[PDB]
């Protein structure tokens, strides 16, 4: 059962005519809540169901002040307005930790999904990282990894040849390993076709994120102790 630690909670703040209203929120869930068509409930976003004047100092808002500003004193009705119209306040440590966390996740997600369209091959994480530096990418502490991946990809595509692309790999493995390979495959992609062979081996066509071509081969080879054949489809 999930909860934001009080250490990890951030503040969402809304000011009206010089008066602050603040709530303590899970930063990941708060970011999701801000997205279009999110299924995250406000109850899951809030660390406590209380509206503060100052959330770090613990001074809380009057019901009268909330009614004046929001036309409601219900924290579950006030909070969505603060989240959608307000700002996010981070401590120095939180900003540093969040940027670092998201930076690594962005590098990995790009490395996983991307290929070099010139040769069809993956870019190692280190290459993506180097491109981000060249493009002087600033990672945001708060924006979701999903949103930032697209921003960052656009920024680095002038530095390196890069595109998100799924690829299809045909694999051939001994029949004894087919059950086991299904489990490995499910970490990497989706089986689009599979056929037991006349000779007892098993062939599967697997659609994977293009940046995983080498990792996929490595895991399959380790599983089958080298008893695997792979090729890119066509």
Residue numbers in the entry: -1 to 232
From the paper:
The Methanothermobacter thermautotrophicus mth685 gene, which encodes the homologue of the Shwachman-Bodian-Diamond syndrome (SBDS) protein, is located in the predicted exosome superoperon. The SBDS proteins are highly conserved [Pfam:PF01172] in archaea and eukaryota. Mutations of the human SBDS gene are associated with the condition known as Shwachman-Diamond syndrome (SDS), an autosomal recessive disorder with clinical features including hematological and skeletal abnormalities and also exocrine pancreatic insufficiency [OMIM:260400]. The polypeptide chain folds into three domains: domain I (residues 1–88); domain II (residues 89–162) and domain III (residues 163–232).
We obtained crystals of the full-length mthSBDS protein (residues 1–232) belonging to the P2221 space group. The X-ray data were collected to a resolution of 1.75 Å and the structure was refined to a final R factor of 19.0% (Rfree of 21.6%). There are two molecules per asymmetric unit (A and B) resulting in a specific volume (VM) of 3.2 Å3/Da and a solvent content of 61.6%. The model contains residues 1–232, except for residues 33–35 of the second molecule (B) for which there is no clear electron density. Surprisingly, there is a substantial difference between their conformations, resulting in an overall r.m.s. difference of 2.5 Å between the backbone atoms (residues 1–232). Indeed, the high overall r.m.s.d. between the two molecules is due to nearly pure rotations about the hinge regions that can be defined in the boundaries between these domains. Thus, keeping the central domains of the two molecules superimposed, the observed rotations for domains I and III are ~13° and ~29°, respectively. In the crystal, molecule B makes extensive interactions with its copy related by crystallographic symmetry. However, sedimentation equilibrium data for the mthSBDS protein showed the presence of only the monomeric form in solution (data not shown). Thus, we conclude that the biological unit of mthSBDS protein is a monomer.
